[PDB]
């Protein structure tokens, strides 16, 4: 799975 803290500016949905 992706790391959500790799870039905090990315919301895990779009």
């Amino acid at each position, epitope marked *: 799975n*992706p790391d959500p*803290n*790799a*870039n905090p500016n990315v919301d*895990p949905n779009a």
Partner: antibody
Amino acid sequence: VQLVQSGAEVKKPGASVKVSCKASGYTFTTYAIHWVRQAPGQRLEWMGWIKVGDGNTRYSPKFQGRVTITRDTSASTAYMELSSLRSEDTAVYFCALLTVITPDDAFDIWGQGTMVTVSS
Amino acid sequence: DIVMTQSPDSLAVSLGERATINCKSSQSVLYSSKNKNYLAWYQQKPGQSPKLLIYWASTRESGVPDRFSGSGSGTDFTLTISSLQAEDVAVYYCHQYYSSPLTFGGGTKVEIKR
């Protein structure tokens, strides 16, 4: 919505450089500021990010011992300080709101870049 | 690190014809359950800062022209510029934001023939 960086610099090997990134046009605490370097003729290398809200940082392992990212919330400014400079650190250093992606919107903003030359 | 490799390193294409830029990641950047690829494309001109064209491998940023389109899934990604315009001369970079450190491809220079 702007990021504006400090001007070019020359340093000698073994010194440190501190670059600033003035943010304007949005609530400074909302997003994370990143620092990306581009050695002349080379690819982009991510250095690390700071959450402006709480001040938490993440650094790339290549720089983990040598770089410090900080911010002044009242000044609306982020800083990146690179220590123990080598000729190899000659590059353009950018600050950036990299890939702000929400369900509503997507944007991405970069500073104009700060050239740093390390030389004797 | 997820290593991003582009090909070709440089490309020369006539005004109005099709330009294809390739990107390979060293591991999959796909979140399979969300069919979401953590892949982006940037355009950079000399002396200027990069500009985001595409994210989630295939979604255009607002105000990016229709002639730019991104596709692919897993480890192989393509940016296609279908009807090349003079203002498109630039270096194009892929970018993953699946895992830390964030990483970028080596760049592909797109030159114009006229």
